[PDB]
């Protein structure tokens, strides 16, 4: 029972689709009796595709064609990284129903691009929560946010500028994905900072923030 990889195919996206499984070149697919969201939280963690959103045990019309049902049973906690960290004891135990397949709609992961500037290390901030790129707001912006986003950018440390280059690097246009983002200084990236809900902003596009480092 070695799940090397669990690809997501037959779906609109790279990591939105049905769950497969790979062992010893045999591409196989997984049914499960207890197939919760935490299993998808594992599955879109070992692939590194965002947080897990939806986990449908949704059947389709029978002419799809499908691989057989994976031999072991996979029930675990969900806080772990890969499909090897939790046990898959009952090998050869196929107690799914007749013709069904699972489905995961985990998010595309957080790609963060500093746009509008001459270099990629200096520009207005733009983030990717959904498929649409969008800026973030400067409500209660702090130097902890600057050092967190520069740590995630992999581009050194902030210098805390005098706001003139940030106002000169562009107002931007589009949508504002984040407002009132608040980083504690220790988070690896911008998702793990406290913020208002994605896309719910009380600011216009004139308040798009820029981080210089």
């Amino acid at each position: 029972p070695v799940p090397e990889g669990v690809r997501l195919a037959d779906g609109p996206g790279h990591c939105k689709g049905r769950v497969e499984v790979k062992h010893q070149n045999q591409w196989y697919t997984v049914c499960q009796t207890g197939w919760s969201l935490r299993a998808a939280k594992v599955v879109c963690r070992q692939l590194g595709c965002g947080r897990a959103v939806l986990t449908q045990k949704r059947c389709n019309k029978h002419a799809y064609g499908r691989k057989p049902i994976w031999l072991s049973q996979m029930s675990c906690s969900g806080r772990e990284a890969t499909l090897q960290d939790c046990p898959s004891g009952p090998w050869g135990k196929n107690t799914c129903n007749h013709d069904e397949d699972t489905w995961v709609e985990c998010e595309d992961p957080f790609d963060l691009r500093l746009v509008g500037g001459d270099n990629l290390c200096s520009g207005r901030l733009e983030v990717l929560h959904k498929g649409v790129w969008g800026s973030v707001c400067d409500d209660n912006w702090g130097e902890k946010e600057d050092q967190v986003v520069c740590k995630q950018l992999g581009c050194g440390k902030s210098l805390s500028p005098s706001f003139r280059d940030r106002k000169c690097y562009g107002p931007g246009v589009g949508r504002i994905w984040l407002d009132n983002v608040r980083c504690s200084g220790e988070e690896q990236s911008l998702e793990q900072c406290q913020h208002r809900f994605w896309g719910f902003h009380d600011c216009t596009h004139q308040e798009d923030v820029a981080v210089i480092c």
Binding site: R58, K61, E100
Partner: protein, 230 residues
Amino acid sequence: VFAIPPSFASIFLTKSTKLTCLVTDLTTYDSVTISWTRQNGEAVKTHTNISESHPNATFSAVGEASICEDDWNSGERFTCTVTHTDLPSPLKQTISRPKGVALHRPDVYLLPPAREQLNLRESATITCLVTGFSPADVFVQWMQRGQPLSPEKYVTSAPMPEPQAPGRYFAHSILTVSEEEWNTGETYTCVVAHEALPNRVTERTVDKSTGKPTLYNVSLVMSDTAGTCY
């Protein structure tokens, strides 16, 4: 006899539409027919997915068929034929989705436990008052600190019609927590799922600190030079 439909509880929590009829052990039969037949006539195959485990327990099984298409949401005359040679009359049951029921959003009210109840210092009953929903089926789950509470902690009633309203229903959900949890100020959130809700789920939270206050202390600082808030 029973044929439990997928409600909005089974639709939303599990994301799997399972047609289920329960064949109680009236008499032991070898080839128990729990064949879930469509109005079209094709049968999505189910057989003994879980035993009934009734007090008699004489060859009783539950057949759950995953007709998970849009044909249930649109609607069809689905029939499981509980036809048996023992008691030779076929004790079948037919269930369909109820058609054209008007959709009104639930107004969800979270009632804190009574002051009379906390004086006993034994248990606190938090009431989730889901009322005003005209489609009958509703799913109510309690969470504390973002973790789903166990279903033995809370008990939710069947929806019954609201008295003054014509066809709108109401439901309760009584969460029985110990008094030392509620008096320390622990947030108990009522997650309720309904079709007529815009985001499909409403979360009311209650705790002692929000509650009903027993000492408002207001300070209307009328300052000339306020201008911007600080």
